Amino acid sequence: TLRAAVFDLDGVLALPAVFGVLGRTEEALALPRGLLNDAFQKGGPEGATTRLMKGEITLSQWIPLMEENCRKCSETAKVCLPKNFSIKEIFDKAISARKINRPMLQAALMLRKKGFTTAILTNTWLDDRAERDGLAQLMCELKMHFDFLIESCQVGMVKPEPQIYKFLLDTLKASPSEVVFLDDIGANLKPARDLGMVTILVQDTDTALKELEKVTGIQLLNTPAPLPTSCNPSDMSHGYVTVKPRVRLHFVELGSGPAVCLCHGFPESWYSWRYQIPALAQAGYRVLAMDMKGYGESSAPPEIEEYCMEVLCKEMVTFLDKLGLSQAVFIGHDWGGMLVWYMALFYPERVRAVASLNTPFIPANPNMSPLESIKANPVFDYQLYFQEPGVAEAELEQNLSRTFKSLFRASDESVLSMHKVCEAGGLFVNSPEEPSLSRMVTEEEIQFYVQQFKKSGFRGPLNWYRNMERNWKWACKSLGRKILIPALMVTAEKDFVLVPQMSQHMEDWIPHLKRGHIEDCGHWTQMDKPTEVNQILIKWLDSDAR
Amino acid sequence: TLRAAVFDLDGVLALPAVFGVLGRTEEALALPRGLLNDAFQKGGPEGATTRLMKGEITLSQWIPLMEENCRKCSETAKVCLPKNFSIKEIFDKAISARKINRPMLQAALMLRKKGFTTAILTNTWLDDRAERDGLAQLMCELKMHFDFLIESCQVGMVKPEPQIYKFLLDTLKASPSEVVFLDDIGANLKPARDLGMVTILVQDTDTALKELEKVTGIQLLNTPAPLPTSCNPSDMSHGYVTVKPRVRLHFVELGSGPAVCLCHGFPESWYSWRYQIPALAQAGYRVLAMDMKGYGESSAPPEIEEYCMEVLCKEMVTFLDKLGLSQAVFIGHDWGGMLVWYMALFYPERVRAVASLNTPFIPANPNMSPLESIKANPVFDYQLYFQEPGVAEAELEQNLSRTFKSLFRASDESVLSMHKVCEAGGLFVNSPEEPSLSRMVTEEEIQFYVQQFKKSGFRGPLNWYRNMERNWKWACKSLGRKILIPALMVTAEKDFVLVPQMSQHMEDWIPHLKRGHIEDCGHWTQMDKPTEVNQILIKWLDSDAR
Ligand SMILES: Oc1cnn(-c2cccc(C(F)(F)F)c2)c1
Ligand SMILES: Oc1cnn(-c2cccc(C(F)(F)F)c2)c1
Numbered sequence A, B: 001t002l003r004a005a006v007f008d009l010d011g012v013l014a015l016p017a018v019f020g021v022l023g024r025t026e027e028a029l030a031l032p033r034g035l036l037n038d039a040f041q042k043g044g045p046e047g048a049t050t051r052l053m054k055g056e057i058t059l060s061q062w063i064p065l066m067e068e069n070c071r072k073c074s075e076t077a078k079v080c081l082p083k084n085f086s087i088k089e090i091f092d093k094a095i096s097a098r099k100i101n102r103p104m105l106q107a108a109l110m111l112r113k114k115g116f117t118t119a120i121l122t123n124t125w126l127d128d129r130a131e132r133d134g135l136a137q138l139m140c141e142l143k144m145h146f147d148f149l150i151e152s153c154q155v156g157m158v159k160p161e162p163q164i165y166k167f168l169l170d171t172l173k174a175s176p177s178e179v180v181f182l183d184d185i186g187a188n189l190k191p192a193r194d195l196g197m198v199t200i201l202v203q204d205t206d207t208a209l210k211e212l213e214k215v216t217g218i219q220l221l222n223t224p225a226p227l228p229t230s231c232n233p234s235d236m237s238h239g240y241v242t243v244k245p246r247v248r249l250h251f252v253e254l255g256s257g258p259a260v261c262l263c264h265g266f267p268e269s270w271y272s273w274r275y276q277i278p279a280l281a282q283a284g285y286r287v288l289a290m291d292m293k294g295y296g297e298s299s300a301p302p303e304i305e306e307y308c309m310e311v312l313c314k315e316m317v318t319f320l321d322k323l324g325l326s327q328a329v330f331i332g333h334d335w336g337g338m339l340v341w342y343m344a345l346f347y348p349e350r351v352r353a354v355a356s357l358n359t360p361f362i363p364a365n366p367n368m369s370p371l372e373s374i375k376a377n378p379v380f381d382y383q384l385y386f387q388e389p390g391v392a393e394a395e396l397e398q399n400l401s402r403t404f405k406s407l408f409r410a411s412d413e414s415v416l417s418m419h420k421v422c423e424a425g426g427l428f429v430n431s432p433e434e435p436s437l438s439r440m441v442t443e444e445e446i447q448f449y450v451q452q453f454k455k456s457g458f459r460g461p462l463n464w465y466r467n468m469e470r471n472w473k474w475a476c477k478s479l480g481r482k483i484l485i486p487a488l489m490v491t492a493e494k495d496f497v498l499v500p501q502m503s504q505h506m507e508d509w510i511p512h513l514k515r516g517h518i519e520d521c522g523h524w525t526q527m528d529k530p531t532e533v534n535q536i537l538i539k540w541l542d543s544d545a546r
C-alpha cells in the first residue's frame, strides 16, 4: 500500500534543527522564554519569515528584519537584548552546527532500495550569506539520495499551506494514502493527515524509525551496515583527453579540491573505483577515475610497446599537462599500483602523494632477467601464460560474463587457482561454465564490465604484461633513487598473488612510507572491502596530501 | 636556412638563474668567493651534481651531499660556514625566486609562429622537495609553448656531453646548421658550435634577442604586444554531463583551484572563451567553458520551452550536482550574461560570485509585457525578427561562413545595422555575399564555428529568444530580492545593442556591484579585447572570489 516516503530537512534529515537554536540562545542568554521564537514568527503568514520561506526575499535581506522583530518583541516584554546580540551570528553558528542525521538518511536509502519513491519537502530559504557554501554542501550530499527535493523558496509555497501538499502529491504521482510523511512540527503534519497520508511526528529518531518500520513493514532499525554509495555510470561527468594522435584517455570526474587520480588494475575499469569515487569527493577531493590505456572508452592500440611503463607514465604526465594540473595524488591498484610507484620515481614534481593497494614497490634486480624473476614464484605463472600474443586473448574473450564472474570473487569463493596455469592450458580450464555470482558483485555490475570489454577486448590489457624486459631496463635507471614524497602502501591479507609479505622491504626505498592493512580481503580490494579502503585512503589523504 | 631554435631554462627562459644564487649567497654571507660554486661542482663528471642532473639521484638525496661538499670546501679554504647555513633553504628560495623571462618566451613564441621548431634543452633534476609544485607549475607554463622539452634528468645525459647534442639533433630532425642554440654558459655552447650550430651566449636578454633577430632575420624586439594564448580544440579535456534524459552538456575544462563556469552568448560556443581559458587557469582557477544548451556538442532539443531561463538554470544546477561542485563562479556574456544573473537570483547558494560582460541586470517590469518593452527600443528589433520559428533559422543556416563572418566584427568594421531588421526582411539583406575577414578572427577560427553549427543549426540557439513571456513571469517572482553575493558588471563602450548606459541603475539591485569598462570594444567582447577582459576578470576573481 505505501509507495512513498517524504522527509523534512530541519529536525528530520538534519540535526540539530535551526528552530532549536532560538530556544537554546534564549536559554544561554537568560532571555524571556520564547522571545526569539516570537520574533522569528512575527506577522505569521504576512511576516518577514514567510516571505523568506516563499523565496520573496533572501536570507541576508531577512536578517535585519528578524533583528527589528527581536527589538519589538523585547520592548513589549519590557527587557533588553545583550550588547553584541547578533542574529547573523546565531544563524551562522546554527546552520554550520546542523549535520546529516545518518540513521534517518539510511532509512530513507533502504526504503528507496525496496522501491519507495522518496522526497525531501522543506521550508527553506535563498541563502546568500558569505558562508552559504556550507549549506550548499549539505543539500548536495542529501539530495543525490532522493527522487525529489521540494523547497518552499523555489516553489513559492510553505508548510502548512495546503497547496504545497497538493504540489507534493502531484510531484510524487501518488494518492495520499500511498504516502508516509515525517516531520518534527505537528502543525505541518496536520494537512498531510487531512488528505489521509500516514504521518510520523519525529521527536527522537529511533522512535520515529520504529513507527516508520511498523507502518511500512520494512526493517530500518538495527540493520546491518550498508555499502558506501556506488556510482551510476550515466550520472557521471565523462572526460576525454587526447594525449597523442592515436591515444585519447577517458576518465570519470567528481568533486572539488586537490586532484586525485585513480588508476585501476587488470582486467578492470574506472568502475572498479565506484565505491571510492563518491566517498573521496565527499571528503574534499577532485577525483579523476581513469580508464587506463587499453580499457573501456580509452584508446587501445594493438602494439605491445604502446603499454610499456615508460610510455604509459609519459602519457599520464601529458594527461595532467592537457588538464592544466601541475600535480595529482596518484592512487593505483594492481597494474595501476605499479604505475603510480613509477610516476613517483620518474615524475615526483607531478605527484602530490602516491598510494598503492596490493602492489608493492620492488626495485628491479639489475642482475636477473625479469622473466627469470617471474619464473621463481609459482604464483606468478599466470604472467607467463599471458606472454604469447593471442593465447590469453582467446580464452578471456571467449565468454565475457564467465570471465569477470570467474575473476571477480572474494577470498573464500575462488574458482581458479593461479597455479600452474600454463601447464593446465589456461586460467579457466577447471572452472565452471556458469559460475555463481560473487557476493561482491551484482549481475548488473558484471554486465557493465562485459559491455566495456566488448569495445577492445583483452589485447591492450594483456599487453601491460608483455614489456617485462623494457620495463626492467627503464626501472634500472631509477635504482639510486628513493621515494621521498608522501606514500601509502595498503596490503590485502588474502591476496594470494600480491601477498602482504612481498611488501616487507619497502621501507628501504621509501623510508617514510605509511601503511594500512585490510584483513579478510582478497585481490579485488576496492569492491571486496570498500568501507575499509575508503576509511584508510581518506585518513591518509587528509593527513598527507592536504 | 635556420629552421630551429633551442633555449636553455635557467638563465635563458627563466630568471634569475639558480647558479646565480650560489654567487649571491657567498656575497650576502661574506663567504670566500666561489666557495659554493666549488661545492656545487665538486667531483666534476663523477660528483653528486652530475648524478643529480643525469637523474641517478633526486634533489632531496642531493641536498645532504652538497652539504658535505660545502663542509669539505670550507675546511680546505680554512673558513667556517655560518650557524644555520642551509642548502635546502638557499635552494627553496632560489627556485621560487626564478620566474619566466617574458621577452625570451615571447621571442620563442614569435619564432614558432614563423614556422621554427622550438625546444627547451635543460640540465635539471628530479624534484621531490615538499615545495616541488612551484617548479612543476613553471615547467607546465613554459613547455606548452615549445615543440620539445628535453631534460637532462629524463634522458640520462647532461650539457656539455656531446651525446645530448646528437640527441637534440635527432629529436629536432634538423641538421646542425639549421639550428640556433641559446645558453648562458659558454662551455655549454661549445659542443653546439663544434657541430656548426649558430650559438648565442645569453648575458642580458635584449642583447641575446638582438643577436637572435639578426641571425634569423625575424623581428623579435620592440614587437607589438601579442594576443593572450588561445586554445587548440583538440588539445583540450572535453567533458560531458547528462543533466536529464534528452540533455547532455559539453564543456572544456582547464586548470585547478576554484571552479569558474563560463557561459557564452548567441550565436557562439565554448570557443568564444578561447582567450580567457588558458589565462584564468594560469591565474589559479578551474575553468569550465560550456557549450550552452542548443550549441556545439551539447544537446539541442527542438522545443521552445526547453530554452526558457528557468529550465536552463535548473539544468546548470544539475550540472554542478553531477560534477560534485557545491558552487562555481558564473561568468556570462550576452545570453549567458542574462543566465548568470538569474543563477545569482534563484540559486545564490550555488554561485560563488557572478560576473556579466555587456549584459546588464534589469529587473522585469511587472506592469509591461516583455514584447512591448522590446518594441520600445529600436535596437532590439533583431529580437522580434527572431520570434517566428523558421524565419531566422533559414537566413542564418543558409551560408554559415557568411553568417559568422558578418556577425563577428569589431566596432569599426560592422556590415549590418541592427536597425529595422524585420522591415528590411532579414539580418543580412544589406551585407555582402563574401564579407572580408574581421581583424578579430582568422579563417580557421570562423571554420570552427561553421563546423560546430553544422551539428544542430540555429533552432536551439534562436529558441533562447522565444521565451520572453515565460522568462518575464519567472523573473517577476524575484522582484523583492537583491543580489548580495560578489558581482561584477563589465560594460563594452561600442556595443550598440547592450550599451553601457543600460546598466546604469544596477546598483539599486546589486548595492555592492563592482565594475569594469572596456573602451573601443564592440559586442564580441572576449575576442575583441581579450587582453583587457583577462586583466579585469582575474583582478576581480583574486579579490572577490578567492
Ligand atoms: O588471490 C588472488 C586471486 N586472483 N588474483 C589475481 C591477481 C592478479 C591478477 C589476476 C588475474 F590476472 F587473473 F586477473 C588474479 C589474486
Ligand atoms: O553593437 C553590436 C553589433 N552586433 N551586436 C549584436 C548584439 C547581440 C546579438 C547580435 C546578434 F544576434 F546579431 F548576433 C548582435 C551588437
Ligand SMILES: [Mg+2]
Pocket (backbone or CB within 6 Å): A008, A009, A010, A011, A012, A183, A184, A185
Ligand atoms: Mg522541521
Ligand SMILES: [Mg+2]
Pocket (backbone or CB within 6 Å): B008, B009, B010, B011, B012, B183, B184, B185
Ligand atoms: Mg644555464
